């Protein structure tokens, strides 16, 4: 999980719901194009209550729910064809996406530009599986894992990097 | 100390924001189109800069001055001729 | 003026403490919760699957001994650099003219 | 106005604490319970099969020391920025005319 | 407002969709430049010509004045 | 060209280039500036141009005025 | 992470969106040139609150957000010069940047001026990987 495979996207809320993208793996922040107003997540066992008696959304199979029963509209798109006049009422989501399998020679991905040796060792792994030179397996695997952890740490030392955090004293009026 | 005004040349070979081998064309084409738009806006101030200041000013300025001159000349000529012939 | 500033800083510092503490956040290890259950708060059930140390009250600070005592001193310092006292008897013309 | 806001925040913060705590949720490890038995609440039986540490009272927060003391201060501050006191004697025309 | 982060290839098309307005409006600009140029030329010519005209005219007028 | 000192250099970054969205915004900036200019000054030019076009129309009108007036006062001086 | 690869740089905010440079890896301090003043970092979940009801900022994908609608500025892209005399309201960034991959023999980098044996050993590593001499690898 890292940025380069992240994605911005608008949704198409019809009524407090929306269907999940095929390409979705894992979610990070969602909110509105305007004002921010970050959503947070909860379970049905709570949201259903909040219906009986901020924002809350949850996961029902292939569907997203939202309590306050929202409406967003995906952009107006095309016509002359210069921009995507985004819609007011739009909420935007950030989610990690399943990258495409190459299925082509000249094809490429951010990875190779970045960290190919990774792919190299990790596939050599299953190769040395095809034919039983295990010790090589162990070596390849260890190295792949080491590389990978280097990466995630590159990211961790990023995601909070700027200055001392400081826990907010968020207190509502009164 | 610096600005990020230069043009897209390379791709991140480490760093998980920005350019990849499958996106560099987008950056470069965006830069080209932006520079082309500027070319236009600047040449435009020029045509427009030029057009306006230049011709508009030479036209109006001298027409007005020359037509005032016309009034003056005509008046003078007529008056003089008449009065003198009367003499 | 001093006393109003000081007591305002202290009560502001006391109120915030009480409020943050009232929040009662529960800290928890990552792979255990059974989020579904925890979020339900109907009298009884949480399945702290695994561990058993997976959920513990967050470590809020105590209040300070000093807030207490200084809020103390200020009270009396008002009540000696001025003649006011929330419990004491007031003057009359008579005692203004003869304290005896 | 201030005092009514403040005491409303405190009692609201006290009431919620007491209610959440009253729920008395029991936390429990995943593979033990004997769910069938636990849900029965007729005087005696639970088969905490296995373990013995499988069920433990959920860690509710304590109340805060500050709720207590500040609920305290506000009471008196009403009773000094106004002449009202829930136990004290009232005035009469006579004392209005002569406190002696 | 706050928009989403489109993939680069789209920002490219957005950038491209600026150049055309510029192109067309430049053509009218050029046509009109040629116009105000013809106008200014005509203007200068007429001005100088009729100015010399009034000059020699008042010359002959003062000649008639001396004759009287 | 120091042994260990870390403060004697800074290996330049991959590139000091912006993320495409800024290039799009810049294109739109130049575009909109130019567009405003066009509309407004085109209205001005056209009307003002047709205007001083009728301007030199009346100009050569008084031009033929002084033509027949010369003509006129040249005949006048011939009379004298 | 060390100094020699760090960077000074000015930013163009536009009340938020201020975008992250490609070359970016990790950010140390960030501030203004005006009067000296340090930002600090936080999450969306807080800055958003700051909206509804010091300067903070956060990381929205490839974007930097700042709670107050700041307006530091850079000259627009086609540029022409760069001196700029830093627009009063300029903020400057100190961040570690991805160095360039070598692409030439006479290329260079501080590392070799200072600590080449490092590269030597570490690449010998993957070499002794190419061809199976693992003890050498460990060493």
Strand D55-57 with G56-60, pairing? unpaired
C97: how many CB neighbours lie within 10 A of its CB?
7
Q: Radius of gyration of chain E from Cα atoms?
A: 29
Question: Which burial class, exposed, middle or buried, applies to C79 when counting CB atoms under 10 A from its CB (0-12, 13-18, 19+)?
Answer: middle
| Dihedral-angle region of residue G101 (phi above 0 means left; psi in -120 to 50 means alpha; beta otherwise) | beta
Tell me if A156 sits within 8 A of A2, measured CB to CB: no
Query: What's the rounded Cα separation, in Å, for the pair C94 and C89?
Result: 14
Tell me if D23 sits within 8 A of C44, measured CB to CB: yes
Q: What tokens appear for D55 in the block?
A: 């069920």
Nearest-Cα distance to chain A for B71, in Å, is: 56
Query: What's the rounded Cα separation, in Å, for the pair C15 and D46?
Result: 44
Nearest-Cα distance to chain B for A83, in Å, is: 14
E-strand stretches of chain A:
8-10, 17-19, 24-32, 40-41, 56-60, 63-66, 91-97
Residues 6+ apart with CB under 8 A from C3: C74, C77, C78
First to last CA, chain G: 24
The position carrying tokens 């919760």 is C33
Residues of A in contact with D5 (CB under 8 A): 174
This entry's atomic model was obtained through cryo-EM
Residues 6+ apart with CB under 8 A from B20: A4, A108, A109, A110, A113, A114, B11, B12
- Count of positions (residues) in chain E: 68
Residues 6+ apart with CB under 8 A from D90: none
Query: What's the rounded Cα separation, in Å, for the pair C18 and C20?
Result: 6
Residues 6+ apart with CB under 8 A from B37: E15, E18, E19, E22, F26, F27, F30, F31, F34
Four-residue CA torsion sign, E30, E33, E35, E37: negative
Tell me if B58 sits within 8 A of E41, measured CB to CB: no
Tell me if D55 sits within 8 A of D48, measured CB to CB: yes
DSSP structure class, residue G57: E
**Strand, coil or helix: B43:** helix
Q: What tokens appear for G22 in the block?
A: 């490609």
Contact B69 E61 (CB under 8 A): no
DSSP codes of every residue in B61-78: HHHHHHHHHHHHHHHHHH
**Strand, coil or helix: E49:** helix
Query: What's the rounded Cα separation, in Å, for the pair G10 and G72?
Result: 9
Is A166 an 8 Å CB contact of chain C?
A: no
Q: Which of C16, C39, C40 sits opposite A169 (nearest CB)?
A: C16
Query: What's the rounded Cα separation, in Å, for the pair D12 and D88?
Result: 28
Query: What's the rounded Cα separation, in Å, for the pair G24 and E27?
Result: 44
Q: Which of A31, A161, A164 sits opposite G27 (nearest CB)?
A: A161
The position carrying tokens 């209040």 is C63
- Count of positions (residues) in chain D: 100
Q: What tokens appear for A133 in the block?
A: 């030179």
Maximum alpha-carbon separation in chain E: 92
Q: What tokens appear for F61 in the block?
A: 């009108």
Tell me if D35 sits within 8 A of C47, measured CB to CB: no
Helix H or strand E encompassing G92: strand G91-97
Query: What's the rounded Cα separation, in Å, for the pair C49 and B85?
Result: 126
Query: What's the rounded Cα separation, in Å, for the pair C56 and F8?
Result: 50
Residues 6+ apart with CB under 8 A from E31: none
DSSP structure class, residue F14: S
Contact A36 G25 (CB under 8 A): no
Contact B11 A115 (CB under 8 A): no
Is G139 an 8 Å CB contact of chain E?
A: no
**Strand, coil or helix: A59:** strand
Query: What's the rounded Cα separation, in Å, for the pair A139 and G129?
Result: 9
Query: What's the rounded Cα separation, in Å, for the pair G98 and G100?
Result: 7
Question: Nearest to residue G86, comparing CAs of G139, G14, G12, G138?
Answer: G12
Nearest-Cα distance to chain A for D6, in Å, is: 7
DSSP codes of every residue in D37-61: HHH--SSS-----S-S-SEEE--PP
Nearest-Cα distance to chain B for E24, in Å, is: 11
Nearest-Cα distance to chain B for G112, in Å, is: 20
Contact G62 E5 (CB under 8 A): yes
Query: What's the rounded Cα separation, in Å, for the pair B68 and G52?
Result: 66
Chains G and D touch (3+ CB pairs under 8 A): no
- Count of positions (residues) in chain A: 174
Residues 6+ apart with CB under 8 A from A42: A56, A57, A58, C39
Query: What's the rounded Cα separation, in Å, for the pair C74 and C5?
Result: 11
Q: What tokens appear for B52 in the block?
A: 């306006």
DSSP codes of every residue in D56-80: EE--PPPPPHHHHHHHHHHHHHHHH
Four-residue CA torsion sign, D2, D5, D11, D16: negative
A66: how many CB neighbours lie within 10 A of its CB?
22
Chain B's closest residue to F36, CA to CA, is: B41
Tell me if F49 sits within 8 A of E33, measured CB to CB: no
Four-residue CA torsion sign, A127, A130, A132, A134: positive
Tell me if D9 sits within 8 A of A174, measured CB to CB: yes
Q: What tokens appear for B15 in the block?
A: 């760093």
Residues 6+ apart with CB under 8 A from G9: B1, B2, B3, B4, F16, G21, G92, G93, G95
Q: Which of A9, A82, A83 sits opposite E4 (nearest CB)?
A: A9
Question: Which burial class, exposed, middle or buried, applies to A91 when counting CB atoms under 10 A from its CB (0-12, 13-18, 19+)?
Answer: buried
| Reported resolution, Å | 7.4
Query: What's the rounded Cα separation, in Å, for the pair D50 and D86?
Result: 58
Contact E54 B66 (CB under 8 A): no
Instruction: Show me where chain F is broken: residue before each gap, C-N > 2.5 A.
Output: 70
Helix H or strand E encompassing D4: helix D2-22
Residues of F in contact with G99 (CB under 8 A): 11-14
Question: Nearest to residue F49, comparing CAs of E28, E26, B38?
Answer: E28
Residues of D in contact with C17 (CB under 8 A): 64, 66
Go through F1-26 and write b for each residue having 16 or more CB atoms within 10 A of its CB, e for each that does not. eeeeeeeebbbebbbbbbbbbbbbbb
Query: What's the rounded Cα separation, in Å, for the pair C64 and A99?
Result: 54
Query: What's the rounded Cα separation, in Å, for the pair C65 and C74?
Result: 15
Residue G80 C-alpha from the chain's centroid: 24
Q: Which residues pair with A91 in a beta bridge?
A: A32
Q: How far is CA G4 from CA C91, F9, F24, G8, G111, in A?
A: 78, 5, 33, 11, 9
Query: What's the rounded Cα separation, in Å, for the pair B45 and F33?
Result: 9
Q: Which of C16, C20, C39 sits opposite A45 (nearest CB)?
A: C39
Residues 6+ apart with CB under 8 A from G63: E5, G16, G17, G18, G19, G20
Residues 6+ apart with CB under 8 A from A150: none
Question: Nearest to residue F1, comparing CAs of E9, G113, A31?
Answer: G113
Tell me if E61 sits within 8 A of B77, measured CB to CB: yes
Helix, strand, coil percentages (3-state) for chain A, rounded to 5, are 30, 20, 50
**Strand, coil or helix: B32:** helix
Query: What's the rounded Cα separation, in Å, for the pair B33 and E11?
Result: 10
Four-residue CA torsion sign, A9, A12, A17, A18: negative
Query: What's the rounded Cα separation, in Å, for the pair C68 and B14?
Result: 55
Contact E64 F42 (CB under 8 A): no
Contact A162 G41 (CB under 8 A): yes
């Amino acid at each position: 999980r890292i940025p380069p495979l992240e994605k911005e996207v608008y949704l198409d809320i019809k009524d407090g719901v929306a269907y999940i993208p095929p390409d979705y793996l894992e979610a990070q922040w969602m909110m509105r194009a305007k004002d921010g107003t970050i959503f947070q997540v909860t379970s049905p066992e709570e949201i259903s209550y909040r219906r009986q008696h901020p924002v809350n959304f949850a996961r029902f199979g292939s569907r997203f729910i939202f309590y306050p029963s929202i409406e967003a509209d995906t952009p107006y798109y095309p016509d002359d064809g210069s921009p995507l006049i985004p819609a007011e009422n739009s909420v935007i989501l950030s989610y990690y996406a399943d990258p495409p399998e190459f299925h082509e020679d000249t094809d490429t991905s951010t990875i190779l530009t970045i960290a190919p040796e990774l792919l190299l060792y990790f596939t050599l792994r299953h190769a040395c599986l095809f034919v039983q030179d295990d010790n090589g397996v162990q070596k390849w695997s260890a190295l792949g894992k080491a590389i990978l952890d280097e990466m995630v740490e590159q990211n961790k030392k990023q995601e909070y990097s700027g200055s001392p955090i400081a826990i907010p004293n968020n207190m509502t009026r009164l | 100390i610096v600005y990020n005004n230069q043009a897209p040349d390379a791709v991140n070979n480490v760093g998980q924001f920005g350019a990849t081998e499958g996106s560099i064309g987008a950056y470069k084409q965006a830069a080209e189109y932006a520079a082309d738009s500027k070319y236009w806006a600047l040449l435009a101030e020029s045509k427009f800069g030029t057009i306006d200041d230049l011709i508009a000013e030479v036209e109006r300025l001298y027409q007005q001055g020359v037509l005032m001159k016309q009034d003056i000349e005509d008046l003078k000529q007529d008056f003089k001729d008449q009065d003198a012939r009367l003499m | 003026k001093d006393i109003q500033d000081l007591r305002t800083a202290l009560v502001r510092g006391y109120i915030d403490n009480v409020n943050n503490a009232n929040y009662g956040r529960y800290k928890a290890l990552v792979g255990a919760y059974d989020r579904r259950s925890l979020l339900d708060n109907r009298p009884g059930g949480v399945v702290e699957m695994e561990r058993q140390d997976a959920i513990d009250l967050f470590p809020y600070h105590n209040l300070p001994q000093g807030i207490d005592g200084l809020l103390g001193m200020s009270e009396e310092l008002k009540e000696t650099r001025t003649g006011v006292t929330k419990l004491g008897m007031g003057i009359n013309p008579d005692v203004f003219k003869n304290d005896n």
